[PDB]
Structure 1
């Protein structure tokens, strides 16, 4: 098959001469696009007469009803749109598409050239005829007999500009998606276009392709591959220091990953605590509401308050309160709601089911209830906006106390690891202590991930033992890695992620805020980043800290001077890679991360 979409204006001889580019082969079918001007009529009848004889190829005529002359530019835009729609319809494939641009206005010829470039044409040529015809023999062929003489005397020089593949994005545009309104009027088609969606789509595709080509160079320094389609101004905005105030709305819309969150530290005070208490099944067993006063300046205390005070700041919720089934259900539902409000796409929650067990409720019952509450909340949400929740069991080390809880939690984790293989799963154990290796060989033999929770100590021996004795795949609150170059290098080489909680670290330990340049006491976030460590930003306790994931990502701008927004994107990518998810959850998380909010303040 070989088609030729020609253009006709005041001179109808272009089509008959263009009908001989191949020669004896000709074209199996040809079409013409022109205007509706009355002057184009006699040319149309002449073309019909020419088509009467030599009726080997297929014939049709299409004129635009809304564009005749060249007295407007909006008419030019409409002509371009109609030309593109007609090329899409009468030319499904550019491989079998031969385009002639001899006929039509100058703007018309440019339109054919541009359409060939955008949508591709197997071959574009320009038909020429010697003026050795007509009266005086000084005019080109303009009649049936003269046209035949030119075709019979080899009086047509054809200039072929070569194949033209076009754009990959503009070659898969089917005409049905861009219908053209036609009205049969005799042996010709009167085509009209309804909307200009085609031009806008083409312009957007071209701009996106230009952005992709401009960002191609540095495609290995972008944490998310989908960032290459951003305008260069946006990619420059992404390399500037994060603004804690103007960037609040951009951070709030980011799809975030939560890896360090405690179930029992969520609704520790305020209205959430009262809602949780109201949800209680039996309101009589509810313990009295203790009076826990927040330190002045909370959530930013004037001075650090250490870990014991921080933990005691959340005694109105947890072990004594979550033993009520209704309170536990309300806790889980409100935590999922809070995760949704922050646009978290993947979260790992830490729970202590043994702490919530009673006479009639074993740790297994509590764990199953928590898992099913989270799964039901997940299923009640659209998949496009659904946060995936997995569970980690916290095996804490009491101060010379109940060591049976550690065994119970480890056994519970080992059982729940095989119990559930879909939806909400139990993916690891959090070892808040030892900062014991014999207790955890069974954990490693069943494929459970281990995360070690450092606390109330600044020793590197604990980190060394967690990395090489407990085989931890993540470290929590490892704020003293720089104090041992060997340990820092090992952590970077082995890909062990470090969980940092800005507000929790600031309130428990305290760091300089809003300084000018990195001193010897600054937050180690950027020092870790420059060392190759996979750093993730978390919340620790939503309630005790009063800070969300957005709040922590924003406070990183005051704890770390000059931290850029590409750095927060890198932290999110690090969290996505460090999650204990499986292939399906990892694919879903990566699909969610590929949707970064577009900046709004890229004007300085």
Structure 2
């Protein structure tokens, strides 16, 4: 197939002359674009007579109804829109497209050239006639007899500009997406453009292509590969230090990943605690609301309060309340609502079903109820904003105490790992208080991921036994990793993720704030990132800490001077990579992460 597109102005001989570009072979069909000027109607009638006298290929003449003459840039813009739509309609395939640029204004020929360059064309050529005609024998063909004699005498020279490859993302557009209206006035069509959707789309695609090519060199330094389409100014903004007050909206709109979120520390105080209590199935058995005065300056304490006091601050919830089915359901639904409000795309909630068991409610029943509450919450949310939740069972070694709870939690995890295979799942266990792995072989045998929850001890020996004796894949609260260079190198090389909770660490350990340089007591985020460690920022306890994931992300701007927004994105990508999700969950999380919000202050 071969389709020829030609533009005509005051001279009608351009079409018959360009029809002889291929010689005796001819064109399978020639299409002519025309303006609305009345000065060209005799040209149109002569072209129609020529076409009738030369039957064969399909003929169609298109006139721009709204373009009578070139008076301003608006007329040229409308002509460009109409020409693009007409080329799409009459030339669906760029390999079958032949374009002639003899006729039209000096801008119209450039319009055809640009259209061929963008949307592609098999060949773009210019038809010329040797001046030997007229009464003086110096003009070119102008009448039917003159055009016929010019074609016969071979007074025509064609300038073949060569095929135009076009662009990959503009070579796939189709006419039905952007239709064109044509009013037939005799054998010539009168076309018009209803709107400029096609041109706006083309301009946006070209701008996106320019953005992609500009940042193409150096794309491996970007966390999200889809982030390379950002404008260079926005990337420069991304490479700047985070502002805790200016970037609140951007951090809030970010799709985040949660990995350290204790379920029993969500509704410890405030209105959420009363909302949970009012949902109790047996309201008479609710324990009295004791007085738990928060330290002054919460959530930013003046001085560190210690792990024991931090634990004691959450005595109004947990095993006291969640032994009631109604309180447990309310806690689960409120936690899911809080996760949705913070734009979290993947969360791993760690719970202790054994603590919540009753005489008639075994730990298995409690775990099943928690899983079903989370699954029902997930299934009631649209997939475009659904936060996938997985469960970690918390086995804790307490001072003295009984070892039955640890065994029960391990067995419950080892059972739930195979019971559920879709939706909310038990993805692993975390070992809090354990350096002693003799009963942890079965969890490794069944493929359960293990994360070790580091405690008050600032012992490098604990982070060693977690890595090489507990076979931990994530370390929680590993703030003293830099004290042993060998351990830091091992953690970086083996890809063990270090999950950090800014507010919890500040309230328990305490770190300098709003510094200008990196000190000896400074928060170890930037040091870990510079060493190649996979660092993740989490919330720990939403209720006790009284800070969401966005607040934790923003607080790094104060804890670590010079923290950049790209490093926040790096932490999010590290959390996504370190999650215990499967293939489908990981691909869904990656799809969610690609939708990075656009900045609001340019650069």
What TM-score does the superposition give when structure 2 sets the normalisation length? 0.99
Q: 1:283-312: CA deviations, max 9, x gaps?
A: 001000010000000000000001000000
In 2, Cα distance between the equivalents of 1:194 and 1:291?
70
Indicate conservation of the 8 Å contact 2:262/2:350, yes or no. yes
Report deviation, 1:36. Answer: 1.1
In 2, Cα distance between the equivalents of 1:103 and 1:599?
47
Report deviation, 1:54. Answer: 2.1
In 1, Cα distance between the equivalents of 2:422 and 2:46?
72
In 2, Cα distance between the equivalents of 1:182 and 1:13?
24
Report deviation, 1:15. Answer: 0.5
Segment drifting more, 135-144 vs 488-497: 135-144
In 1, Cα distance between the equivalents of 2:557 and 2:575?
18
Indicate conservation of the 8 Å contact 1:435/1:455, yes or no. no
In 1, Cα distance between the equivalents of 2:55 and 2:484?
88
Indicate conservation of the 8 Å contact 1:416/1:426, yes or no. yes
Q: State the match for 1:440 in structure 2.
A: 440
In 2, Cα distance between the equivalents of 1:187 and 1:32?
12
In 2, Cα distance between the equivalents of 1:386 and 1:42?
65
In 2, Cα distance between the equivalents of 1:187 and 1:100?
21
Matched residue of 2:423: which SS? coil
Indicate conservation of the 8 Å contact 1:67/1:79, yes or no. yes
In 2, Cα distance between the equivalents of 1:425 and 1:188?
67
Matched residue of 2:33: which SS? strand
Matched residue of 1:354: which SS? coil
Indicate conservation of the 8 Å contact 1:467/1:473, yes or no. yes
Do structure 1's residue 106 and structure 2's residue 100 form an aligned pair? no
Report deviation, 1:436. Answer: 2.7
Q: State the match for 1:597 in structure 2.
A: 597
Report deviation, 1:56. Answer: 2.1
In 1, Cα distance between the equivalents of 2:223 and 2:352?
35
Matched residue of 2:372: which SS? helix
Report deviation, 1:188. Answer: 1.6
Matched residue of 1:95: which SS? helix
Q: 1:503-547: CA deviations, max 9, x gaps?
A: 000000000000110000000000000000000000000000000
Residue pairs, 1:283-302, within 5 angstroms: 283-302=283-302
- What is the total number of aligned residue pairs between the two structures? 603
In 2, Cα distance between the equivalents of 1:100 and 1:414?
74
In 2, Cα distance between the equivalents of 1:33 and 1:432?
77
Q: 1:136-186: CA deviations, max 9, x gaps?
A: 111101111211111111111001111101111111110001100112222
In 1, Cα distance between the equivalents of 2:126 and 2:357?
86
Report deviation, 1:435. Answer: 5.3
In 1, Cα distance between the equivalents of 2:438 and 2:148?
98
Report deviation, 1:399. Answer: 1.0
Indicate conservation of the 8 Å contact 2:435/2:469, yes or no. no
Q: 1:247-267: CA deviations, max 9, x gaps?
A: 000000000000000000000
Report deviation, 1:402. Answer: 1.7
Indicate conservation of the 8 Å contact 1:6/1:100, yes or no. yes
Segment drifting more, 101-110 vs 492-501: 101-110
Report deviation, 1:18. Answer: 0.6
Aligned-residue RMSD, C-alpha:
0.7
Indicate conservation of the 8 Å contact 2:396/2:434, yes or no. no
Q: 1:5-52: CA deviations, max 9, x gaps?
A: 100110111000110111111110110111111111100000001101
Matched residue of 2:318: which SS? coil
Indicate conservation of the 8 Å contact 2:435/2:470, yes or no. no
Matched residue of 2:191: which SS? strand
Indicate conservation of the 8 Å contact 2:499/2:536, yes or no. yes
In 2, Cα distance between the equivalents of 1:137 and 1:13?
17
In 2, Cα distance between the equivalents of 1:20 and 1:307?
90
Indicate conservation of the 8 Å contact 1:375/1:423, yes or no. yes
Q: 1:482-504: CA deviations, max 9, x gaps?
A: 00010000000000000000000
In 2, Cα distance between the equivalents of 1:367 and 1:20?
82
Segment drifting more, 187-196 vs 78-87: 187-196
In 1, Cα distance between the equivalents of 2:183 and 2:261?
65
Report deviation, 1:134. Answer: 2.0
In 2, Cα distance between the equivalents of 1:357 and 1:24?
92
Indicate conservation of the 8 Å contact 2:481/2:488, yes or no. yes
Report deviation, 1:355. Answer: 0.3
Identify unmatched segments of 5+ residues in structure 2. none
In 2, Cα distance between the equivalents of 1:346 and 1:20?
65
In 2, Cα distance between the equivalents of 1:57 and 1:150?
21
Misfit runs of 4+, over 3 Å: none
Q: State the match for 2:349 in structure 1.
A: 349
